[PDB]
RNA sequence: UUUUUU
């Protein structure tokens, strides 16, 4: 009855970074990972 | 000297072809006979075919055998229209311009070696002094032995 | 003995449109590009249903009156099958460019439009396909005629059929037939629709390999 | 026969122009008005200046001005009567190239939300129409005082028998084949617009381009006099 | 209703231009990998300049001639932007780009004297061939000029017209079944090459695609020949350029017209060798 | 015992009816709709199930769905609200007081033509959608203006649904090779940034080329 | 051009190839009116309609209703039917139809008061089925009756009559001619006046030859004709109102 | 400018 797609299967995170390239980005990714786990 | 039109190519028999006996109703088979053809070197088409054989009673059986173009070209057709327009085959120094398309005159009526083809034949019962008593006209299928 | 000629179908050729379907039927060829749900002008604002535009263009000459009638037939078939109540105040544009005209344009056009509406992702209730029969002077019918069979015959019928229960969706006519001939052409069209609807499922499995 | 013993059909050599006379300020009802003639080609240009957008208000750009150019030929120009409605294709192009050349150097930066219209009407075409229209529009703009980068001059050139020709007539555009018109602003030498419809070979190209630019510079050395003469006989009446 | 370009798109793409690197990875002087395909019947071609498809069709009829020109045939061009090509190409909205392409194609392939008009006249003043070509833009991701010129030249090369025989005053045409259709008389193959100028003529580029046309401010078209003759040139976009730039541009355009003429000749030879042995559509080199 | 839930890893055709066994009702995904006691299929795709049934299709046009992370582009501003292009049917709205720590005294710095990362709060068929850049508690978890100097491009939604699984392949290799940072957006949009331009181009090609 | 079914390239009428000498219709009384059959409200899907018949002249009119200082603007479209008259005109027309439409628009605005219609428009559509005679005047009269039955506010009706001049040695004005009496004619005139306010609403008449006195006599004779013609239109609109 | 093979 809902056309969603994030709360159907499973998504990943918000604004995923890599190679500690940026900064605040790593922490946000870690928080997303914590939410996932 | 224009190349052949597309509707005329449709009226040829199909290119994978062998001898079909169902069209040989009035025809007689003479594969056992030896028949050779002599030709000025380097032809694609050939139409002459001969044999001579001694009979038991001192007589001779002489056969002139001709390729049957008429078994393939029905009247009123567009291939008949092309052959009625051109009429004869024009020969030049470098190349020639055939009246019949190259498929038919190259393979399906040129009496190649050691293959059977349709033919229209005349048989003479001629003596050792070569005068003729009886003459026969027939449709046949002919397997030539050699080209010379 | 009634069977179609050779089918070929290709998806996702063009980059810019939302869907792309090339459909090769024998020698004829129709390419269809469909824009998805997009913005409308204010004049076509319909609050219940979605506007569904169809543009049909042949390759020689500029398009005329008969092509306008054909594209109205396309818009009515599609809005019969496109579940358009789900998307209000949006416009779906279906564009058809005739690549090769070898006979029975409307069948190949409807097949290309159906594949293009599938691949673009517009929600529909059912599939649909188009076939054609040709009635000669004697009465022997031919499914999917060539241009020469279309030219010689006394009747040409084109039917667009549905996928759920094989019902008649669209019908166009150039001929002088009787009703029993109509019934026989409809039955042969249902058999041909069975073959084409299997051909849809085979190509849609051929896409999703990865 | 076009050029034999160095002389052309008109009786002029390969470098010199036609006689061109430009008059400013014809229509006092409008804002800027110019009338120019190059030989027998008559051109008339009217510009209504930076007025606000009257209708269809979504067309306005927020930063720069908008330039609208419309080319209309008279119906009695050549021998055969031609009709400007239902004959729009040639004209639509001739307007859009004028739009290009006058969005090139008109300084749209100083006039936000502003519409500048340039209307050019040709009264008698005798070859070299495009250059005459651009020159008429330049004189018309410099009537109305829209501040622009540079004086704009355009001319044409051809290539016959190994020699370059400047400022072609209708005869020389008819039989010849190589036409090359250009619009030029001479303070920096920057070619503002190129047009060429020919079968011209590459090894000659630079030569005729130089001659084309040279003809343009001659136009800039003539019309300038007219403008200064005009503005001089303004100031004597003022102060 | 088209999607607008980002500011960051503009800034990143201009910074990419300032170090001589494209988006896809080619150099500044490289056309995309082209592909020529043919239709079933004569004169139907599909040109892919690389995610940009142009359809080309040649039709031909018998029309009474124009009165001033009694002894040659009329060419009539139509380049129509299809609806599927770009979402902003609604009919009647894009008049400017339509006229700007149409007149350029018409001037090139008419006033270049590319294909003969004098070979067409059947009966002077009464019957003459009339050739109409139609180009449809199917997918818009680059130069419509270059792909349109390629498609028009390939369609003029591939087209065949039915024979007519003139005997006294009898004009007897034939069906394509009754006679072989003869090919058309062509002098040479002129072609168009598009150049993109960025930030007032500092940086020269060849063959911009969609983003690369949205960020640019100058376009130039040079039409050249096999024998290295320049047919037509046209500037657009409101830029100012020195003559040294077009003098160096003609040379690169000559190299490119030589390569694409090689590609078109390989295309025609491969299609003809396909149709000699059973009949099909002849793909063509995509390099 | 056919066409209820047996084909749970196959490719369905749009329109083939399937039903659920048996009160305990289930929830339908994006492709399926309800009809009495059966489920109507509207798209092509492969059916997947998790305990909900859902089908996925590689389609380009995004439909506005409530609560998704979407990169949008500022169109213009009109007073308090400013409009954003999403790539959908109608452009969405933003209020300047919806950003983190903003009132009438402090305007958030939003310029015309800058990309914005946020999420839709209201998105249905009835009205135009509206998005925000704040969490439910009242803070920004990386939302707002992305900034400049990073290449934006557009991909298929199926690629995003493949890459943002917890089981992925390309993202870990890309993070292993060298430094960079990227932003995904559920309408099919990817923003990238590396230290140099060449690595940014190689990243863009490797991301879009599969 | 391509929105209609094309046919032959060029066609000719048969009457020019017809070999016959058609006689003049002879002599008549000058003030001999044609019998008038008018009825209003004939159509259903239009807001107001009128049908007017006079001898061999037929005309129909219908009015689309109002749709969205400021002043109303009635723009009127005048199409002739393609099979009215000997020669067949093109279905767009384009030359003569806009010329008659300006006569309609400049004759109807003194009738319809437009201060009561801010930012609205009215579409008056007239259609001429059979060109038996005075073509402009019957269109004016039927458009006036259709606007009256449509329910827009007016000051008066519009009654129009056409005139014509026989080209004999003594030029004598004729009133309400037939098509043959226009084909023989030299000069034809058409007036229309609101009979209650007694003011001319529009006069359009092409000339061949005349003098200033003769045009004055023709104008006052046309005024007498329209004033004479009025009560049949009155009783017809009364009966059409009694149907309501 | 017959005549037989091309």
What 3 state SS string does chain F have?
CCCCCCCCCCEECCCCCEECCCCCCCCECCCEEEECCEEEECCCEEEEECCCEEEECCCCCCCCCCCCEEEEEEEEEECCEEEEECCCCCCEEEEHHHCCCCCCCCCCCCCCCCEEEEEEEECCCCCCCEEECCCCCCCCCCCEECCCCCCEEECCHHHHHHHCCCCCCHHHHHHHHCCEEEEEECCCEEEEEECCHHHHHHHHHHHHCC
* Experimental resolution (Å): 3.8
What is the crossing angle of helices D205-238 and D129-144, to 10°? 30
At A9 the three-state DSSP class reads: coil
Q: How far apart are CA D108 and CA D130, in angstroms?
A: 23
The DSSP element (H or E) to which D88 belongs, if any, is helix D88-104
Whether F63 has its CB under 8 Å from any CB of chain C: the answer is yes
In angstroms, how far is the first alpha carbon of chain F from the final one?
Answer: 39
The string of DSSP letters for B96-127 reads EE-SS-HHIIIIISS--TT-EEEEEEEEEEE-
CA–CA min distance F31, chain E (Å): 26
Interior angle at CA D154, CA D153 and CA D158, nearest 5: 145
Query: Are E271 and E158 in contact, with CB atoms under 8 Å apart?
Result: yes
Domains along chain G with CATH numbers: 1-244 (3.30.230.70)
Name, in order, each residue with C-beta under 8 angstroms of C129's C-beta and a sequence gap of 6 or more: C107, C110, C111, C114, C160, C161, C163, C193, C196, C197, C200
Nucleotide nearest to B37 (CA to C1'): H5
Q: How far apart are CA B95 and CA B97, in angstroms?
A: 7
How many domains is chain E built from?
Answer: 1
Instruction: Count Cβ atoms within 10 A of the Cβ of residue F48 and give its class: 0-12 exposed, 13-18 middle, 19 or more buried.
Output: middle
Q: Could you check: is the Cβ of residue B42 within 7 Å of any atom of nucleic acid strand H? A: yes
Name, in order, each residue with C-beta under 8 angstroms of F176's C-beta and a sequence gap of 6 or more: none
Q: How far apart are CA F21 and CA B90, in angstroms?
A: 85
Whether F95 has its CB under 8 Å from any CB of chain C: the answer is no
Are residues C86 and F125, on separate chains, in Cβ contact within 8 Å?
yes
Structure tokens at F144: 């707002």
Distance of CA F158 to the CA centre of its chain: 11
* E43-71 as b/e: b if 16+ CB within 10 A: bbbbbbbbbbbbbbbbebeeeebeeeeee
Query: Are G88 and G10 in contact, with CB atoms under 8 Å apart?
Result: no
Query: Are E246 and D194 in contact, with CB atoms under 8 Å apart?
Result: yes
Query: Quick one: closest CA in B to E180, which residue?
Result: B5
List CB contacts (< 8 A) between C123 and chain F.
14, 31, 33, 42-43
Query: Are G160 and G141 in contact, with CB atoms under 8 Å apart?
Result: yes
What is the crossing angle of helices E144-158 and E243-275, to 10°? 40
The string of DSSP letters for C102-129 reads SS-HHHHHHHHHHHHHHHHT--BS--EE
Distance of CA D138 to the CA centre of its chain: 7
Interior angle at CA D159, CA D154 and CA D164, nearest 5: 70
Tell me the Ramachandran region of residue E86: left when phi exceeds 0, alpha when psi lies from -120 to 50, beta otherwise: beta
Closest CA to G195 of G111, G117, G138: G111
Query: Are E108 and E257 in contact, with CB atoms under 8 Å apart?
Result: no
Domains along chain D with CATH numbers: 15-239 (3.30.230.70)
Query: Quick one: closest CA in B to E177, which residue?
Result: B7
Q: What is the CATH number of the domain that holds E170?
A: 3.30.230.70
Cross-strand partners of F190: F153, F184
Cross-strand partners of B35: none
Structure tokens at E269: 């030879």
Closest CA to C128 of C171, C161, C102: C161
H helix intervals, chain B = 6-9, 78-86, 102-103
Instruction: Name the CA radius of gyration of chain B, rounded.
Output: 17
Nucleotide nearest to B67 (CA to C1'): H5
Whether B9 has its CB under 8 Å from any CB of chain E: the answer is no
Cross-strand partners of D44: D35, D121
Residues in chain E: 287
Q: How far apart are CA E46 and CA E55, in angstroms?
A: 5
Query: Are C64 and F63 in contact, with CB atoms under 8 Å apart?
Result: no
Interior angle at CA F69, CA F65 and CA F74, nearest 5: 95
Q: How far apart are CA D184 and CA D181, in angstroms?
A: 10
State how beta strands B146-147 and B36-37 pair: parallel
Helix, strand, coil percentages for chain C (3-state, nearest 5): 35, 35, 35
Query: Are F65 and A3 in contact, with CB atoms under 8 Å apart?
Result: yes
Structure tokens at E29: 């002087």
Deposited experimental method: cryo-EM
DSSP count for chain C of H helices, then E strands = 4, 9
CA–CA min distance A15, chain F (Å): 5
Structure tokens at B133: 């008593």
Instruction: Count Cβ atoms within 10 A of the Cβ of residue D90 and give its class: 0-12 exposed, 13-18 middle, 19 or more buried.
Output: middle
Q: How far apart are CA E42 and CA E62, in angstroms?
A: 18
Look-up: residue for tokens 């090359």?
Answer: D180
Whether G5 has its CB under 8 Å from any CB of chain C: the answer is yes
CA–C1' distance B80–H2 (Å)?
28
Q: Could you check: is the Cβ of residue B40 within 7 Å of any atom of nucleic acid strand H? A: yes
Beta strands in chain C (DSSP E): 7-11, 19-25, 28-38, 51-57, 91-100, 128-135, 141-143, 155-162, 168-175
Q: Tell which strand H nucleotides have any atom below 7 Å from a protein Cβ.
A: 5-6
List CB contacts (< 8 A) between E179 and chain B.
2, 5
CA–C1' distance G93–H3 (Å)?
80
Q: How far apart are CA E123 and CA E120, in angstroms?
A: 9
Cross-strand partners of D118: D47, D69
State how beta strands G73-80 and G121-130 pair: parallel
The DSSP element (H or E) to which E232 belongs, if any, is strand E229-236
CA–C1' distance G127–H3 (Å)?
89
CA–C1' distance B110–H4 (Å)?
18
Structure tokens at D151: 């004086």
Listed by start position, the domains of chain F span 1-61, 62-147, 148-210
| Secondary structure (H, E, C), chain G | CCCCCCCCCCCCCHHHHCCCCCCCCCCCCCCCCCCEEEEECCCCCCCEEEEEEECCEEEEEEEEEEECCCCCEEEEEEEECCCCCCCCCCCCCCCHHHHHHHHHHHHHCCCECCCCCCCCEEEEEEEEEECCECHHHHHHHHHHHHHHHHCCCECCCCEEEEEEECCCCCCCEEECCEHHHHHCCCEEEEEEEECCCCEEEEECCCCCCCCHHHHHHHHHHHHHHHHHHHHHHHHHHHHHHHHC
Name, in order, each residue with C-beta under 8 angstroms of C72's C-beta and a sequence gap of 6 or more: C54
DSSP for residue E92: T
**Cβ neighbour number for residue G171 with a 10 Å cutoff:** 16
At E235 the three-state DSSP class reads: strand
CA–C1' distance B48–H3 (Å)?
17
At C98 the three-state DSSP class reads: strand
Q: What are phi and psi of G201, to 5 degrees?
A: -95, -25
Structure tokens at F176: 């292993």
At D86 the three-state DSSP class reads: coil
Instruction: Count Cβ atoms within 10 A of the Cβ of residue C49 and give its class: 0-12 exposed, 13-18 middle, 19 or more buried.
Output: middle
Are residues E87 and C16, on separate chains, in Cβ contact within 8 Å?
yes
Q: How far apart are CA C76 and CA C53, in angstroms?
A: 10
- HSE (side-chain half, CA atoms, 13 Å) at B147: 17
Tell me the Ramachandran region of residue B96: left when phi exceeds 0, alpha when psi lies from -120 to 50, beta otherwise: beta
Which of F60, F124, F210 to probe by mutation at the C interface, max C CB count within 10 Å? F60
Listed by start position, the domains of chain C span 1-210
> Which residues, numbered 111 to 170 in chain F, qualify as contacts with chain C under a Cβ-Cβ cut-off of 8 Å?
125-126
What are the CA-CA distances from residue E65 to residues E129, E156, E173 (Å)? 9, 21, 18
Q: Could you check: is the Cβ of residue B127 within 7 Å of any atom of nucleic acid strand H? A: no
Closest CA to C72 of C92, C88, C56, C61: C56
Domain that holds residue E23: 1-287
Structure tokens at C61: 């000459």
At D73 the three-state DSSP class reads: strand
In angstroms, how far is the first alpha carbon of chain A from the final one?
Answer: 28
Question: Tell me: domain C1-210, CATH 3.30.230.70, correct?
Answer: yes
Widest distance between CA atoms in chain E: 72
Name, in order, each residue with C-beta under 8 angstroms of C7's C-beta and a sequence gap of 6 or more: C24, C25, C196, C199
Whether A37 has its CB under 8 Å from any CB of chain F: the answer is no
**Cβ neighbour number for residue A11 with a 10 Å cutoff:** 20
């Amino acid at each position: 009855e809902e056309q969603s797609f994030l709360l159907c299967e499973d998504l990943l995170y918000g604004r995923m970074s890599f190679r500690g390239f940026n900064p605040e980005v790593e922490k946000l990714m870690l928080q997303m990972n914590a939410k996932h786990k | 000297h224009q190349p052949f039109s597309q509707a005329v190519l449709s009226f040829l028999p199909k290119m994978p072809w062998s001898i079909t006996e169902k069209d040989m109703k009035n025809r007689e088979d003479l594969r056992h006979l030896c028949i050779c053809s002599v030709d000025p070197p380097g032809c694609t088409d050939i139409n002459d075919a001969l044999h001579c054989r001694e009979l038991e009673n001192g007589n001779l059986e002489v056969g002139v055998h001709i390729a049957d173009v008429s078994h393939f070209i029905r009247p009123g057709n567009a291939l008949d229209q092309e052959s009625a327009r051109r009429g004869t085959t024009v020969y030049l120094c470098e190349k020639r311009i055939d009246m019949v398309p190259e498929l038919l005159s190259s393979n399906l009526c040129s009496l190649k070696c050691d293959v059977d083809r349709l033919a229209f034949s005349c048989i003479w019962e001629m003596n050792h002094n070569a005068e003729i008593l009886k003459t026969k006209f027939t449709k046949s299928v002919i397997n030539s032995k050699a080209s010379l | 003995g009634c069977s179609l000629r050779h089918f070929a179908c290709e998806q996702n050729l063009l980059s810019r449109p939302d869907g792309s379907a090339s459909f090769l039927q024998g020698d004829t060829s129709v390419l269809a590009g469909v824009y998805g749900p997009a913005e409308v002008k204010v004049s076509k604002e319909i609050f219940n249903k979605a506007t569904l535009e169809v543009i049909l263009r042949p390759k020689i000459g500029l398009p005329g009156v008969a092509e306008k009638s054909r594209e109205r037939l396309i818009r009515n078939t599609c809005e019969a099958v496109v579940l358009g109540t789900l998307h209000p105040r949006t416009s779906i544009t279906v564009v058809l460019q005739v690549v090769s005209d070898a006979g029975s344009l409307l069948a190949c056009c409807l097949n290309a439009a159906c594949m293009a509406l599938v691949d673009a992702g517009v929600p529909m209730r059912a599939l649909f396909c188009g076939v054609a029969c040709a009635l000669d002077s004697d009465g022997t019918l031919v499914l999917d005629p060539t241009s020469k069979q279309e030219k010689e015959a006394r009747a040409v019928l084109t039917f667009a059929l549905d996928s759920v229960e094989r019902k008649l969706l669209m019908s166009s006519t150039k001929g002088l037939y009787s009703d029993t001939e109509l019934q026989q052409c409809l039955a042969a069209a249902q058999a041909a629709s069975q073959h084409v609807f299997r051909f849809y499922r085979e190509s849609l499995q051929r896409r999703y390999s990865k | 026969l076009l050029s034999d013993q160095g002389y052309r059909v008109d009786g002029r050599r390969a470098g010199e122009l036609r006689k061109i006379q430009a008059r400013m300020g014809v229509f006092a009802q409008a804002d800027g008005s110019a009338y120019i003639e190059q030989g027998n080609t008559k051109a008339l240009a009217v510009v209504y200046g930076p007025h606000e957008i009257r209708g269809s208000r979504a067309r306005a750009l927020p930063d720069r001005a908008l330039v609208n150019c419309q080319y209309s030929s008279a119906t009695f120009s050549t021998g055969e009567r031609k009709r400007r409605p239902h004959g729009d294709r040639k004209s639509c192009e001739m307007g859009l190239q004028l739009r290009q050349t006058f969005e090139a150097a008109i300084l749209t930066q100083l006039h936000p939300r502003s519409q500048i219209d340039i209307y050019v009407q040709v009264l008698q075409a005798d070859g070299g129409t495009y250059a005459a229209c651009v020159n008429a529009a330049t004189l018309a703009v410099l009537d109305a005082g829209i501040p622009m980068r540079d004086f704009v001059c355009a001319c044409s050139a051809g290539f016959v028998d190994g020699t370059a020709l400047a400022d072609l007539s209708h005869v020389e555009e008819a039989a010849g084949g190589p036409q090359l018109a250009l619009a030029l602003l001479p303070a920096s030498g920057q070619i503002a617009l190129l047009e060429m419809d020919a079968r011209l070979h590459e090894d000659h190209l630079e030569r005729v381009l130089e001659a084309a630019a040279q003809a343009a510079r001659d136009v800039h050395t003539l019309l300038d006099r007219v403008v200064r003469q005009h503005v001089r006989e303004a100031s004597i009446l003022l102060g | 209703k088209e999607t607008p370009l980002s500011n960051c798109e503009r800034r990143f793409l201009l910074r990419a231009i300032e170090e001589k690197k494209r988006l896809d990875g080619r150099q500044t002087y490289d056309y995309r990998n082209i592909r020529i395909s043919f239709g079933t019947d004569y004169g139907c071609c599909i040109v892919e300049l690389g995610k940009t498809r142009v359809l080309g069709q040649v039709s031909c009829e018998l029309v009474s001639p124009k009165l001033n020109r009694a002894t040659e045939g009329i060419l009539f061009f139509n380049l129509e932007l299809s609806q599927m090509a770009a979402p902003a190409f609604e009919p009647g909205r894009q008049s400017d780009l339509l006229v700007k392409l149409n007149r350029l194609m018409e001037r090139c392939l008419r006033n270049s004297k590319c294909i003969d008009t004098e070979s067409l006249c059947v009966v002077a003043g009464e019957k003459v061939w009339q050739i109409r070509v139609d180009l449809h833009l199917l997918n818009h991701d680059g130069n419509i000029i270059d792909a349109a010129s390629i498609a028009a030249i390939v369609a003029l090369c591939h087209f065949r017209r039915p024979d007519v025989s003139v005997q006294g005053d009898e004009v007897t045409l034939y069906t394509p079944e009754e006679r072989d259709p003869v090919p058309l008389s062509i002098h040479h193959m002129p072609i168009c090459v598009s150049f993109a100028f960025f930030q007032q003529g500092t940086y020269l580029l060849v063959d911009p695609n969609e983003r690369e046309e949205r960020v640019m401010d100058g376009l130039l078209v040079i039409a050249m020949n096999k024998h290295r003759e320049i047919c037509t040139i046209q500037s657009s976009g409101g830029i100012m350029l020195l003559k040294d730039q077009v003098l160096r541009c003609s040379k690169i355009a000559g190299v490119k017209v030589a390569e694409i003429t090689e590609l078109i000749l390989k295309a025609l030879e491969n299609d003809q060798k396909v149709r000699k042995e059973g009949g099909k559509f002849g793909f063509a080199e995509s390099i | 015992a056919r066409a209820a839930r047996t084909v749970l890893g196959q490719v369905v055709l749009p329109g083939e009816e399937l039903l659920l066994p048996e009160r305990v009702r289930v929830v339908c995904g994006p492709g399926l709709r309800r009809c009495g006691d059966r489920l109507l299929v509207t798209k092509c795709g492969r059916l997947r199930h998790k305990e909900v049934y859902w089908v996925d299709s590689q389609q380009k046009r995004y439909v506005p769905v409530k609560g998704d992370h979407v990169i949008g582009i500022v169109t213009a501003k009109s007073g308090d609200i400013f409009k954003v292009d999403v790539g959908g049917s109608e452009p969405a709205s933003l209020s300047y007081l919806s950003f983190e720590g903003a009132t009438k005294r402090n305007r958030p710095n939003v310029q015309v033509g800058d990309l914005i990362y946020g999420q839709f709060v209201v998105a249905n068929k009835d009205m135009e959608p509206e998005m925000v850049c704040i969490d439910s508690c009242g803070r920004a978890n990386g939302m707002g203006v992305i900034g400049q100097d990073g290449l934006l491009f557009k991909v298929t939604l199926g690629l995003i649904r493949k890459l943002l699984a917890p089981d992925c392949e390309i993202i870990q290799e890309v993070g292993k090779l060298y430094p960079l940072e990227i932003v995904f957006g559920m309408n099919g949009r990817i923003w990238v940034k590396a230290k140099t331009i060449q690595q940014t181009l190689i990243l863009a090609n490797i991301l879009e080329a599969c | 051009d391509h929105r209609r079914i094309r046919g032959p390239e060029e066609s000719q009428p048969p009457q020019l190839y017809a070999a016959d000498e058609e006689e003049a219709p002879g002599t008549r009384d000058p003030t001999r009116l044609r019998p008038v059959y008018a009825r209003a409200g004939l159509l259903s899907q239009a807001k107001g309609s009128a049908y007017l018949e006079a001898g061999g002249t037929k005309v129909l009119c219908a009015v689309s209703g109002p749709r969205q200082a400021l002043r109303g603007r009635l723009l009127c479209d005048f199409r002739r039917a393609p099979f009215a008259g000997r020669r067949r005109r093109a279905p767009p027309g384009g030359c003569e139809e806009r010329e008659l439409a300006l006569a309609l628009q400049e004759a109807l605005e003194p009738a319809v008061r437009l201060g009561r219609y801010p930012r609205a428009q009215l579409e008056v559509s007239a259609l001429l089925l059979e060109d038996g005679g005075s073509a402009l005047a019957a269109a004016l009269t039927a458009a006036a009756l259709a606007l009256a039955d449509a329910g827009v506010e007016m000051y008066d009706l519009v009654v129009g009559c056409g005139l014509s001049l026989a080209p004999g040695p003594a030029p004598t004005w004729l009133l309400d001619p037939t098509r043959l009496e226009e084909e023989r004619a030299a000069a034809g005139l058409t007036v229309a006046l609101m009979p209650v306010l007694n003011q001319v609403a529009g006069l359009l008449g092409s000339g061949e030859g005349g003098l200033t006195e003769s045009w004055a006599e023709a104008v006052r004779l046309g005024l007498e004709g329209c004033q004479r013609l009025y009560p049949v239109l009155q009783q017809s609109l009364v009966r059409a109102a009694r149907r309501r």
